[PDB]
Coordinates of C-alpha atoms and ligand atoms in Angstrom, one line a residue:
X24 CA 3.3 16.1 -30.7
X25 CA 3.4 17.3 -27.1
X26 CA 6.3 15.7 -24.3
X27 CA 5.6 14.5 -20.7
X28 CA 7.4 13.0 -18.0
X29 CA 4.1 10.6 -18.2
X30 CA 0.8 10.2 -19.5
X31 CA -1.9 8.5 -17.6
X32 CA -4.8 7.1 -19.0
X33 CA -8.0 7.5 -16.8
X34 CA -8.9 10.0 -14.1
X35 CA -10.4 7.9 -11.6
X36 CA -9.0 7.2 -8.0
X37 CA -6.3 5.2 -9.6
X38 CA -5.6 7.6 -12.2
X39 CA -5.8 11.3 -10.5
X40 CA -3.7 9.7 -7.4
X41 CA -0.9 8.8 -9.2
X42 CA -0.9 11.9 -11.8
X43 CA -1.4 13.9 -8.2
X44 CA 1.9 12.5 -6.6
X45 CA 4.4 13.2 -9.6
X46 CA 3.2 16.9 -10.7
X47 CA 3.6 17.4 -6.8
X48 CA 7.4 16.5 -7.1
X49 CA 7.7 19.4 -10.1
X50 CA 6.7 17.0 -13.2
X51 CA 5.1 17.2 -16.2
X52 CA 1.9 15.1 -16.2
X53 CA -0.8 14.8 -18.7
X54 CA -4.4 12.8 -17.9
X55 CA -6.6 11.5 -20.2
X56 CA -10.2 10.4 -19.5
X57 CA -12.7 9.2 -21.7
X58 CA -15.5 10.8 -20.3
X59 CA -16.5 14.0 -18.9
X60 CA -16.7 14.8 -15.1
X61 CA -18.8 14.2 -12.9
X62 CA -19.9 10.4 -13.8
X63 CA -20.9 7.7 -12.4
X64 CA -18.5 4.5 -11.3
X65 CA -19.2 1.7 -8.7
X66 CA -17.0 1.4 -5.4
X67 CA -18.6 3.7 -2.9
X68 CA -16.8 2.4 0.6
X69 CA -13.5 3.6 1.6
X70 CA -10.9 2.3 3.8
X71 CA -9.3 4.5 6.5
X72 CA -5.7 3.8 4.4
X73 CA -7.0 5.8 1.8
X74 CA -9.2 8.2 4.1
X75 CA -6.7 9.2 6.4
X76 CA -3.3 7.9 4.5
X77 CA -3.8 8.7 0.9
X78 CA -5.9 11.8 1.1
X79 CA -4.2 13.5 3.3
X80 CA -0.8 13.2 1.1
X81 CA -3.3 14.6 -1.3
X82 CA -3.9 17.4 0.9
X83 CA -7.2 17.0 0.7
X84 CA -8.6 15.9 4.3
X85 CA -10.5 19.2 4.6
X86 CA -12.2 19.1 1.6
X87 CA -13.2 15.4 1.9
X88 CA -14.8 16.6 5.8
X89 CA -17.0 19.3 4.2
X90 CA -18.3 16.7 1.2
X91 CA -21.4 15.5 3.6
X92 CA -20.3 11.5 3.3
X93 CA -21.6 9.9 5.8
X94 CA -18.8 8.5 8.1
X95 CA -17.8 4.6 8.2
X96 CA -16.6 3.5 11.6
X97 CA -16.7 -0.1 10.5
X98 CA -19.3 -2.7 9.2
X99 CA -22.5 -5.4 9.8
X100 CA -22.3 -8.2 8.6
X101 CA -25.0 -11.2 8.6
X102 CA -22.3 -13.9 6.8
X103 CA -21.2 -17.0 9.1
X104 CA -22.8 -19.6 11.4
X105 CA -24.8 -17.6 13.4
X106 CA -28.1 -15.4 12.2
X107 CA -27.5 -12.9 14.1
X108 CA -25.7 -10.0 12.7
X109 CA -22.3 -9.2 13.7
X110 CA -20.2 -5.8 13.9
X111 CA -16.2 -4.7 13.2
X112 CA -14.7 -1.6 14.0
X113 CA -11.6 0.0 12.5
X114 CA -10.5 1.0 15.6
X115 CA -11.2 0.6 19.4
X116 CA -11.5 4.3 20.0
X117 CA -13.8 6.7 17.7
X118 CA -11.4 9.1 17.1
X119 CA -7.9 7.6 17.5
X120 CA -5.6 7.4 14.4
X121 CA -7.3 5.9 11.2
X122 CA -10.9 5.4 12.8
X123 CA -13.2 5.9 10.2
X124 CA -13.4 6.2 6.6
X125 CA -16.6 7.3 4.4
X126 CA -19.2 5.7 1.7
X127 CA -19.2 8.1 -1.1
X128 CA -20.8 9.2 -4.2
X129 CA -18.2 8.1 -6.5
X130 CA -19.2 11.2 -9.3
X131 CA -18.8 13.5 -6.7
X132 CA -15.8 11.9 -5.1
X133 CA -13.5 10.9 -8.5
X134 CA -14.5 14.7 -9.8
X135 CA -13.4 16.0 -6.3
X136 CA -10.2 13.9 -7.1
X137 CA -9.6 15.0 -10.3
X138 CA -10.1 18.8 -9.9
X139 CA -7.2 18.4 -7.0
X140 CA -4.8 17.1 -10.0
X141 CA -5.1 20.1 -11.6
X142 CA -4.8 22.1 -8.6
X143 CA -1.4 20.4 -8.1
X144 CA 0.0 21.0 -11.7
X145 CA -1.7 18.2 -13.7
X146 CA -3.0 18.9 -17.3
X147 CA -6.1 16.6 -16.9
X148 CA -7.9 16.8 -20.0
X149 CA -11.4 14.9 -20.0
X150 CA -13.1 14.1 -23.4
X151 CA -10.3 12.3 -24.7
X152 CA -10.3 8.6 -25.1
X153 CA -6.9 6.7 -25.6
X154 CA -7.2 4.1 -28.1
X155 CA -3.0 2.9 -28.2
X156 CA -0.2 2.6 -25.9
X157 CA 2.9 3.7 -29.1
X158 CA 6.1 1.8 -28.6
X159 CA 10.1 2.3 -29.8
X160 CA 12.9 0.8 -29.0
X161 CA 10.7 -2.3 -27.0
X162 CA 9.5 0.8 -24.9
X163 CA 6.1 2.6 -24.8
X164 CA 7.0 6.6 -25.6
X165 CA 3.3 7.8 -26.1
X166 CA 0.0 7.1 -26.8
X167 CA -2.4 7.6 -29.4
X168 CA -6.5 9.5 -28.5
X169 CA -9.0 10.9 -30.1
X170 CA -9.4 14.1 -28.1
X171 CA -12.9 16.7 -27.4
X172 CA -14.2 16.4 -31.2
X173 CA -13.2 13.2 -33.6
X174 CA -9.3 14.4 -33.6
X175 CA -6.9 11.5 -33.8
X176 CA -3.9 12.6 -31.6
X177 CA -0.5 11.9 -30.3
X178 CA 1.8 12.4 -27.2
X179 CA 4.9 11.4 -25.6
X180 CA 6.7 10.9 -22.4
X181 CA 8.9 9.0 -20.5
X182 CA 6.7 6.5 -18.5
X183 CA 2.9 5.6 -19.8
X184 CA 0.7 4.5 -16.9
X185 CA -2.6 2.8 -17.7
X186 CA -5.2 3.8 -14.7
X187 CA -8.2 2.9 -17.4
X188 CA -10.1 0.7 -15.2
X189 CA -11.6 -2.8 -15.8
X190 CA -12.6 -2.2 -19.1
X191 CA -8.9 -0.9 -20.5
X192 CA -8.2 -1.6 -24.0
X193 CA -4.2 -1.2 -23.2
X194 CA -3.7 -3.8 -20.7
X195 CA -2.5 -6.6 -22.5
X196 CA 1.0 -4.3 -23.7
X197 CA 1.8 -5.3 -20.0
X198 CA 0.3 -8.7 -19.7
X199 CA -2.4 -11.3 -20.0
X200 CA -5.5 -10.9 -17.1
X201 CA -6.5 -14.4 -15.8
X202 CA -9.6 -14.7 -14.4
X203 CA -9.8 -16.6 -11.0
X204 CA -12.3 -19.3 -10.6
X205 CA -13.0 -18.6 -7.0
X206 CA -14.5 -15.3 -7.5
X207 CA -17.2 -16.3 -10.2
X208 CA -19.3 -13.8 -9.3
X209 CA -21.9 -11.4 -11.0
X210 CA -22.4 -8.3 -9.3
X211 CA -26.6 -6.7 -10.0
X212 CA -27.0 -3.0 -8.4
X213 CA -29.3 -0.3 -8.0
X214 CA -30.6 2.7 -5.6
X215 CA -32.9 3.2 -3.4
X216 CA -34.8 6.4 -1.9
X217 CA -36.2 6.2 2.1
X218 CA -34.5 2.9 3.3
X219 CA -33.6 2.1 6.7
X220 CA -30.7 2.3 8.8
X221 CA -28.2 0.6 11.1
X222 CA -28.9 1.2 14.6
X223 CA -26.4 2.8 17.2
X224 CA -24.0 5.4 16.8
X225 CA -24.0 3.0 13.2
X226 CA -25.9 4.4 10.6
X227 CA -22.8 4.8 8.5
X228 CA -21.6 1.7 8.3
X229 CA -22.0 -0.7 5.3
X230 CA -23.7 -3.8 5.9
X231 CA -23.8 -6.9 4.0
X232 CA -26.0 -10.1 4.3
X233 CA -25.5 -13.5 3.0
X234 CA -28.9 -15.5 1.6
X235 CA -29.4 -18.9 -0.2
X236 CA -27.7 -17.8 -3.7
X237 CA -25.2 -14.8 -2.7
X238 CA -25.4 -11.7 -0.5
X239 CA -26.2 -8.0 -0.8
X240 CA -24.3 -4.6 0.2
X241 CA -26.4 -1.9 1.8
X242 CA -24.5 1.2 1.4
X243 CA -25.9 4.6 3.0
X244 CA -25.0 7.4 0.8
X245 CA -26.9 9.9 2.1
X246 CA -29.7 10.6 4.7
X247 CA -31.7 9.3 1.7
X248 CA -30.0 7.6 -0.5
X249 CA -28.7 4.1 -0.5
X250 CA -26.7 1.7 -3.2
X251 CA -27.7 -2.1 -3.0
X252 CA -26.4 -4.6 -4.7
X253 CA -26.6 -8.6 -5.0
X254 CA -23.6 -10.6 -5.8
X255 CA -25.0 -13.9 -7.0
X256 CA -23.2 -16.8 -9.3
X257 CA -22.1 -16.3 -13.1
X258 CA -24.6 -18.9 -13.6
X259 CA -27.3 -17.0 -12.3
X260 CA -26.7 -14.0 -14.6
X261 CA -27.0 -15.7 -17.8
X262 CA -31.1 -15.7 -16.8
X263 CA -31.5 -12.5 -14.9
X264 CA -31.0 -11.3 -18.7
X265 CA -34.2 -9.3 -19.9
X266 CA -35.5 -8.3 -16.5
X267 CA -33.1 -6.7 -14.7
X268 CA -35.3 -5.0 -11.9
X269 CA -37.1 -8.1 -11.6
X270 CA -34.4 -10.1 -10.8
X271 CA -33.0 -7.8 -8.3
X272 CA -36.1 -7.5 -6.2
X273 CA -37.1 -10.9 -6.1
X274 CA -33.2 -11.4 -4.9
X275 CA -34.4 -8.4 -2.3
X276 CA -37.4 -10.3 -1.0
X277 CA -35.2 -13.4 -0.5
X278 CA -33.0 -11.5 1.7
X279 CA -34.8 -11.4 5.2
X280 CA -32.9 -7.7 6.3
X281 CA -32.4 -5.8 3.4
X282 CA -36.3 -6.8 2.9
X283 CA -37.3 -4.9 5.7
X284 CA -34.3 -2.0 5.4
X285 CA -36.2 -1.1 1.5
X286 CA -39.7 -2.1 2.9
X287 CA -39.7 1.6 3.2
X288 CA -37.8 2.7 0.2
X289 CA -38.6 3.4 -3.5
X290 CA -36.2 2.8 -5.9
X291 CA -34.6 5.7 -7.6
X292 CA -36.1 6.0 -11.4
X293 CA -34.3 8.4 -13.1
X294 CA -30.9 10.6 -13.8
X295 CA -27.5 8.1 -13.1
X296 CA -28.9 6.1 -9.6
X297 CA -32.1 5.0 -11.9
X298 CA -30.9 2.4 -13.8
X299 CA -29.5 -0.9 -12.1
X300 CA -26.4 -2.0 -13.4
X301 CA -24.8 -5.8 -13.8
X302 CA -21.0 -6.7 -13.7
X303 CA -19.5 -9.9 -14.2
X304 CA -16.1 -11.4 -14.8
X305 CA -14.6 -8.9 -12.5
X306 CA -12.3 -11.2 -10.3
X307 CA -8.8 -11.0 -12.1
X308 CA -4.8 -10.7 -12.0
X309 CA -2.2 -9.6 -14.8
X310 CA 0.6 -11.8 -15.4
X311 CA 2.8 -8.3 -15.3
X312 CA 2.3 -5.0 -13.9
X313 CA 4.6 -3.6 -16.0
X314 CA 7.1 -3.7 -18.8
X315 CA 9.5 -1.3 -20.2
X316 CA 8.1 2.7 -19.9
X317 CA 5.0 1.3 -18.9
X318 CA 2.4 0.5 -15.7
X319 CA -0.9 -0.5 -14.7
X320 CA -2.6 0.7 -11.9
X321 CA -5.9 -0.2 -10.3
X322 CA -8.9 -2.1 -11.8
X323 CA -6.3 -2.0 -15.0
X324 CA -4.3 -4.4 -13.2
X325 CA -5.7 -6.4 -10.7
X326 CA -8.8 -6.9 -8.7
X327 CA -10.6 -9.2 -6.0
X328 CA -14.1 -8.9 -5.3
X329 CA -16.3 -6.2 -3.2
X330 CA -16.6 -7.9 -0.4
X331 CA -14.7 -5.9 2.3
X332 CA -14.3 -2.9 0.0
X333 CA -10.8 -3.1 -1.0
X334 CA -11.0 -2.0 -4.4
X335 CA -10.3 2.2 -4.3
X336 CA -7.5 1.2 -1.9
X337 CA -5.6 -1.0 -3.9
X338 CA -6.0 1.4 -7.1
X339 CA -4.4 4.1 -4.9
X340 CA -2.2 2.1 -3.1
X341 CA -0.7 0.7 -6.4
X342 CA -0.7 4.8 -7.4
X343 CA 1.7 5.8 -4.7
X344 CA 3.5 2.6 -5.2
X345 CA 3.8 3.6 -8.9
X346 CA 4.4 7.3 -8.2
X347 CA 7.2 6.3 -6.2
X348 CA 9.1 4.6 -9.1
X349 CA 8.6 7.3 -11.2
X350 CA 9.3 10.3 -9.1
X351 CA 12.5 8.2 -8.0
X352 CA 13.4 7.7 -11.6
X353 CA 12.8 11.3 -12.7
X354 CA 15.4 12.0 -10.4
X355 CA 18.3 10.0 -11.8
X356 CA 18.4 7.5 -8.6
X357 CA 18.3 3.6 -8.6
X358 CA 17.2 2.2 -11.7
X359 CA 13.7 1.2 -13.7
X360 CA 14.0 -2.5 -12.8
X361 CA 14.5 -1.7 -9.2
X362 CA 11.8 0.8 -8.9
X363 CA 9.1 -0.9 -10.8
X364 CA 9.8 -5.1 -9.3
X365 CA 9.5 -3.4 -5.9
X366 CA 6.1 -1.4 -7.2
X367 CA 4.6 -4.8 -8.7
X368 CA 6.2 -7.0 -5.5
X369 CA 4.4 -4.9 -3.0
X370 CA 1.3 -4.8 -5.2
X371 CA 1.2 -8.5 -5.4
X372 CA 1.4 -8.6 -1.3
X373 CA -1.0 -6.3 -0.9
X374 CA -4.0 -7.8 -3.5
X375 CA -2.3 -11.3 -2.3
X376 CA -3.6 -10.4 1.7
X377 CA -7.1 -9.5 0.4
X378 CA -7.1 -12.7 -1.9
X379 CA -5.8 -15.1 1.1
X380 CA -8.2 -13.5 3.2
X381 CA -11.3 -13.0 0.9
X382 CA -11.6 -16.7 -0.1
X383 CA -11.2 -17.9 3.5
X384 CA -14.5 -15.4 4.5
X385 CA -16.6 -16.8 1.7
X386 CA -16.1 -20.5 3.1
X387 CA -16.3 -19.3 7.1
X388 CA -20.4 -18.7 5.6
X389 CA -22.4 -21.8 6.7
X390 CA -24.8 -22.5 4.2
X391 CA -25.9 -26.3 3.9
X392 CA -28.2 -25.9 0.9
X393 CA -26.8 -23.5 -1.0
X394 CA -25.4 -24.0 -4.4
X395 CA -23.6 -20.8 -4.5
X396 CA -22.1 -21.2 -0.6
X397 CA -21.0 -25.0 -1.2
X398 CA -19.2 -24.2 -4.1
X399 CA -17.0 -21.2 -2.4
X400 CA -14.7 -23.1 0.1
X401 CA -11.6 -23.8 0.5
X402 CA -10.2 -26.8 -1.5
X403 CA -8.0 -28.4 1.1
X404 CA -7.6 -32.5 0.9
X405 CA -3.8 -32.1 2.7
X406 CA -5.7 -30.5 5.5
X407 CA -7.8 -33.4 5.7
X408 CA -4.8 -36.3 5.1
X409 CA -3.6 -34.1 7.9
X410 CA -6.2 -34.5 10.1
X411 CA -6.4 -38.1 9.8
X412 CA -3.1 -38.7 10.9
X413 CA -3.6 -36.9 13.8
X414 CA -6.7 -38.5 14.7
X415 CA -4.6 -41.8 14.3
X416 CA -2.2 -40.9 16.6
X417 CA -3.7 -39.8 19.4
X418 CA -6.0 -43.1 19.6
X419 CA -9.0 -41.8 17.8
X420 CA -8.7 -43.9 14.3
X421 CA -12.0 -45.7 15.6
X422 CA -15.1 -43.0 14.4
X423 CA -17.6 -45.7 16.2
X424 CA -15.9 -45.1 19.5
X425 CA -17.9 -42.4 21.3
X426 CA -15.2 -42.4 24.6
X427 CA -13.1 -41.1 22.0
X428 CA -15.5 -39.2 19.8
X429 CA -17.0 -36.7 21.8
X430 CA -4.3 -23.2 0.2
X431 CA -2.8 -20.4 -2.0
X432 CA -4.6 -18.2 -4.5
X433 CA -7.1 -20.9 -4.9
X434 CA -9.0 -20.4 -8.3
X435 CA -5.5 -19.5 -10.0
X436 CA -3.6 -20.8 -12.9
X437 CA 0.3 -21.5 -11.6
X438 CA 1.6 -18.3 -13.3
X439 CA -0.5 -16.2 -11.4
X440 CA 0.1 -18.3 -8.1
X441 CA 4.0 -18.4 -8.5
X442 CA 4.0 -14.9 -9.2
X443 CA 2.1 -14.2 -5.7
X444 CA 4.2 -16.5 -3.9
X445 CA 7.4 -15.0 -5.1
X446 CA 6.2 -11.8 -3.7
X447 CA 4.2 -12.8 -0.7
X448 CA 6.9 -16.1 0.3
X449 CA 3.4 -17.7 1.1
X450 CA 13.5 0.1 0.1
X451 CA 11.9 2.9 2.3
X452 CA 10.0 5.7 1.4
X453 CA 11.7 9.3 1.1
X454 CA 10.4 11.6 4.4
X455 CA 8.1 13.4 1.6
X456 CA 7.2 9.7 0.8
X457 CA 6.4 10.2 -2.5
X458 CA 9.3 9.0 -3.6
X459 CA 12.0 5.6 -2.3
X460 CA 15.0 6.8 -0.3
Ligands
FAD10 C1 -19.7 -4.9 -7.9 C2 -18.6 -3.9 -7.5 C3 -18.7 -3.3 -6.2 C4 -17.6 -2.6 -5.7 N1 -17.6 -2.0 -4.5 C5 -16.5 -1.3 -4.0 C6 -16.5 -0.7 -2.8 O1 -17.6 -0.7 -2.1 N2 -15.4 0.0 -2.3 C7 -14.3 0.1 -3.1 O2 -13.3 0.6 -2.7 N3 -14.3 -0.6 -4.3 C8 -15.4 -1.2 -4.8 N4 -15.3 -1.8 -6.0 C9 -14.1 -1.7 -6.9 C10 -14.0 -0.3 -7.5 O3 -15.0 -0.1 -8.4 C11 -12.6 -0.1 -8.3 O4 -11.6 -0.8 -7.6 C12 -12.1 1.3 -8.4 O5 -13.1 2.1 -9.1 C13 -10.8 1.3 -9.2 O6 -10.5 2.6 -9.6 P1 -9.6 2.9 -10.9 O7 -9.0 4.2 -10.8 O8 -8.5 1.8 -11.0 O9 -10.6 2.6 -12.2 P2 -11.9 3.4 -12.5 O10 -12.6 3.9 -11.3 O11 -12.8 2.4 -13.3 O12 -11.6 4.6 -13.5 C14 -10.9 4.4 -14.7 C15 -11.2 5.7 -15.6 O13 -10.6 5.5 -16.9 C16 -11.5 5.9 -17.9 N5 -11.2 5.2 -19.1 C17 -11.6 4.0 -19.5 N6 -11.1 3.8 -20.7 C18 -10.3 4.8 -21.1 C19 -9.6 5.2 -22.3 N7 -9.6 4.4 -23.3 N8 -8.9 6.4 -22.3 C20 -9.1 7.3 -21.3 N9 -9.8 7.0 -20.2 C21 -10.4 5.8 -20.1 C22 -12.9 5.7 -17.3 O14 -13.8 6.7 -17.8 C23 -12.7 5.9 -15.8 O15 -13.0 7.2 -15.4 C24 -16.4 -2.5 -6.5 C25 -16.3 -3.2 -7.7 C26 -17.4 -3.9 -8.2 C27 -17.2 -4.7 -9.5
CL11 CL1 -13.9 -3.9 -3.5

């Protein structure tokens, strides 16, 4: 049974990035994925952290220019008071450091991942499911998988990393996921041929539009192609059941612009962009990101919700943050604990901001008469106790007098929400930085 420095489990973004950074330090790495390359996955818009940080560490900024992904200067967004739509940019200048980022075909865009692991001394080896995380000595030392044909198999290494994605069997080795109750969302997707674009210099960007029960992405993939996708309650899901396409477009023609952006689409029929997908339950965060020998990375781990697109940075994020405890480790300097508390600590900041932030944007959306809106706000009561007070004290008590007149993780149980206050309070890197100095 073969030896590593470390096995990781999945060869998405997660996966590949991490496996990537320790092979390029002089490692042995193997990487097992359950399917075979290139497939399908959701999470198509990228963040300039990853664009212009992560992929160039990868050495792979060239190759990601010469792909033909349309280019992401920012986003639309019809979500607030106001109808009108409203624009962000990433930065103030086009071309100035991290400007832009792009919305990708995630087949082409993992694969393109994964082939660089190789390229940097991986032994990525697609076809081969894992179906155990082996412990001794209260550490994981391998794994079990059923490799190419039905072959039950075995390997070994130092640190085990699952990268496996929301539906990892492995998971709970490291901890128990805990759904938050905020993010009670359902997420129903599909493609479309022919639709319209954002005007300007624009056409690029990702849009998203809030309606009466959730609100749609409008990703441009292509000159042709583009994904769209309603996020509506978990309530709502449990009788879109048997008519999948039906529910979608009626959702469509409830949505005043993405009507008239696929008023001169067709929706794509066959091969992978055919069907229309539905994921639920996604909003999530472990009790513990790792344990003794192992880690979990990405979707494995942790995740918010897609609004804002945060999801392939935090799984690659969390990949250089995990990269960095085991390439420091591998090298006889600092110890496990040290490494791996400051991996999961930054982690926890980083999905933390996104959390904070994410929750406060679903209740900035005025909707008066909407189920789904009223129950995404912000659950404050000291605010208002607050604001009482202040009314009394600066003469104001009387509400009939027209002279006068005219928190934290919230949807989380308190082990989740100590554990992010710990690391958010409400080591550098090497000058490779793939590993902490
Ligand atoms: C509705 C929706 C919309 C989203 N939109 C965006 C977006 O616009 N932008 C964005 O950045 N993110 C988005 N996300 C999030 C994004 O999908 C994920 O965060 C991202 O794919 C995480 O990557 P990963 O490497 O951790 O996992 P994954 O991409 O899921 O890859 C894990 C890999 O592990 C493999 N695997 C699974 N089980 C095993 C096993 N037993 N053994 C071996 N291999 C296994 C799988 O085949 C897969 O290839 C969205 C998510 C949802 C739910
Ligand atoms: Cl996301």
């Amino acid at each position: 049974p073969e030896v590593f420095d470390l096995i990781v489990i999945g060869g998405g973004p997660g996966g590949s990035t991490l496996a990537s950074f320790v092979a390029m330090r002089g490692h042995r790495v193997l990487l097992l994925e359950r399917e075979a390359f290139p497939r399908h996955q959701i999470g198509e818009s990228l963040l300039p952290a990853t664009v212009h940080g992560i992929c160039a560490m990868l050495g792979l900024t060239d190759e990601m220019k010469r792909a033909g992904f349309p280019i992401k200067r920012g986003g639309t967004f019809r979500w607030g008071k106001e109808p009108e739509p409203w624009t962000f940019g990433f930065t103030r200048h086009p071309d100035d450091p991290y400007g832009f980022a792009y919305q990708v075909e995630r087949a082409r865009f993992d694969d393109m991942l994964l082939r660089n692991s190789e390229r940097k001394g991986v032994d990525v080896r697609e076809r081969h499911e894992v179906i155990d995380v082996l412990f001794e000595g209260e550490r994981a030392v391998g794994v079990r998988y059923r490799n190419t044909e039905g072959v039950e198999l075995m390997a070994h290494a130092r640190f085990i990393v699952d990268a496996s994605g929301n539906r990892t069997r492995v998971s709970q080795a490291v901890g128990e996921r805990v759904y938050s109750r905020f993010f009670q969302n359902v997420a129903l997707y599909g493609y479309f041929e022919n639709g319209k674009r954002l005007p300007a210099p624009r056409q690029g960007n990702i849009l998203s539009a809030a309606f009466q029960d959730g609100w749609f992405w409008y990703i441009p993939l292509s000159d042709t192609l583009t994904s769209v996708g309603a996020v509506v309650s978990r309530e709502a899901a449990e009788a879109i059941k048997d008519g999948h396409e039906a529910a979608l477009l009626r959702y469509i023609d409830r949505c005043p612009i993405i009507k008239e952006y696929l008023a001169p689409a067709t929706r794509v029929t066959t091969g992978d962009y055919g069907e229309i997908r539905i994921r639920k339950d996604y909003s999530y965060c472990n009790t513990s990101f790792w344990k003794n020998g192992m880690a979990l990375v990405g979707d494995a781990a942790c995740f918010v919700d897609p609004v804002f697109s945060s999801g392939v940075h935090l799984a690659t994020y969390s990949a250089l943050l995990v990269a960095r405890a085991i390439n420091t480790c591998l090298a006889g300097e600092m110890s496990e604990q040290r490494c791996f508390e400051e991996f999961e600590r930054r982690y926890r900041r980083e999905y933390g901001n996104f959390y904070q932030f994410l929750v406060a944007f679903y209740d900035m959306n005025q909707d008066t008469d909407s189920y789904f809106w009223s129950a995404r706000k912000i659950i404050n009561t000291e605010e208002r106790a607050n604001e009482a007070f202040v009314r009394l004290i600066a003469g104001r008590s009387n509400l009939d007098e027209p002279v006068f007149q005219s928190n934290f993780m919230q949807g989380f149980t308190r082990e989740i929400t100590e554990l992010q206050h710990l690391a958010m309070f409400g080591l550098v890197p090497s000058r490779d930085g793939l590993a902490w100095a």
